[PDB]
Every structure is written in structure tokens, then in C-alpha cells.
Amino acid sequence: SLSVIFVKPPFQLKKKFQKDPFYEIEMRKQLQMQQDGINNMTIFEWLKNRENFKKYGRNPKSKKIQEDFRDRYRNAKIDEYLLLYEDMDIKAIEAMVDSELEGLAALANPAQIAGGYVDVVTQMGNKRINSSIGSQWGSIEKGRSLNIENELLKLITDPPPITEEEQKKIKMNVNLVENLEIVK
């Protein structure tokens, strides 16, 4: 196993998300899923994805994966609502579902700057709370995602070091949710 890496600086619940209590709940939900997404990968895996994202950029395949899911999810929800509430006015249901989907985004767990190069999409989440996380991950040259890689390198290079062979068998171990910082 490995020592926990806490994200530095902590993620922030910005001013405009403090009004409605749903946003706090969602930010934890979303940071969790991104956390779980990293801790599912191996040290070598994560470090490669970050290597590639830095060297070649965003993966064009991922936007298509996501829109394809939206389209499925849209139709899936319509059927759920048709059959659950007995409204056969599929145009009404379609209107309603499309409202919901306006403030929803396919969730890349984790984002691509944060080592999720080839993500498989399966859940929807608040588009804005998702874009807050996404910018707070920072840039390649500076930010929270960088601070995770640097700390993770010191861990593997300090003695007794970790070879690629052992990198491929130790899973990531970050925490993005304990220290969530509510702006004051």
C-alpha cells in the first residue's frame, strides 16, 4: 500500500454555491467519484495517463463517448418516466427530461488532466459543479493536479524506491474530499 496524498490546495466550494445546500452535497458526491476514479488505477497507470495528456493533449475520443451517453441517457430516462408515472405524452416527458439534462454533464471520473485519459462514462452530474472541479484541477504547469503528481513522485523515489514493476501493482491513494474548503 501507500501513504495518502491529500490534494493541495483543497478544493473550494465557491461563493455562488453556498446559497443552495444541494451544491455542497453534489460537490462531495462529485469529488468522491473523481477520487474513487483515481484510486482504482495503479501508480504506473495514472502516471502514464498524465504523461500522455501532457505530451499529446486531450483525447478526442472522449467527447464522443460522452455525447453518445447523453443521447442514451436521455432516451433511458424518458422510458423510466413514461412507465413510472403513466404519462403517455412522450412529447411532454421529452420536454421534461431535456430540462433535467440542461444542467447535467457526463462525468469523467476523473478528469483528463487528473489522469483519466480513457474514461468509460456511466453517470450524469451537475454540469456546473463538474466544471468547477474541472477548472480547480488546474493546468499542466500549475494547480492541484500537478501537486498530486509531485507528491506521488517523491513517494516512489525516496528509498527504498519503487520500480515500474512495483508501480504496476500498487494502487493510487489520494483524498480530495476530507479537506473540502467552504469559502468564507
Author numbering: 172 to 355
What do the authors say?
Tde1tox exhibited DNAse activity on plasmid dsDNA, which was abrogated by mutation of the HxxD active site (H279A) and strongly inhibited by the presence of Tdi1 or chelation of divalent cations using EDTA. A structural model of Tde1tox H279A/D282A Ntox15 domain was obtained by X-ray crystallography with diffraction data extending to 2.9 Å resolution. Although no close homologs of known structure were available, phases were solved by molecular replacement using an AlphaFold2 prediction model. The AlphaFold2 prediction model was very similar to the experimental crystal structure; mean Cα r.m.s.d. among the eight monomers in the asymmetric unit was 1.0 Å. The Ntox15 domain adopts a globular fold which is predominantly α-helical, forming a short α-sheet between helices 5 and 6 immediately adjacent to the active site. A cavity adjacent to the mutated HxxD motif marks the active site. A sulfate ion is modeled within the active site, likely an artifact of crystallization in high concentration of ammonium sulfate. The DNA binding site predicted with ProNA2020 (38) maps to helices 4, 6, and 7, adjacent to the active site. Coulombic surface rendering highlights relative positive surface charge surrounding the active site pocket, consistent with favorable electrostatics for interaction with negatively charged DNA. We conclude that Ntox15 domains adopt a globular fold, distinct from other nuclease families of known structure, with a structurally well-defined active site that mediates DNAse activity.
We identify a horizontally transferred T6SS with Ntox15 family nuclease effector (Tde1) that mediates interbacterial antagonism among Bacteroidales, including several derived from a single human donor. Effectors with novel toxin 15 (Ntox15) DNAse domains, also known as toxin_43 domains, degrade recipient genomic DNA. Cognate immunity proteins are encoded adjacent to T6SS effectors and neutralize their activity to prevent intoxication of self and kin. Crystallographic snapshots of isolated Tde1, the Tde1/Tdi1 complex, and homologs from Phocaeicola vulgatus (Tde2/Tdi2) illustrate a conserved mechanism of immunity inserting into the central core of Tde, splitting the nuclease fold into two subdomains.
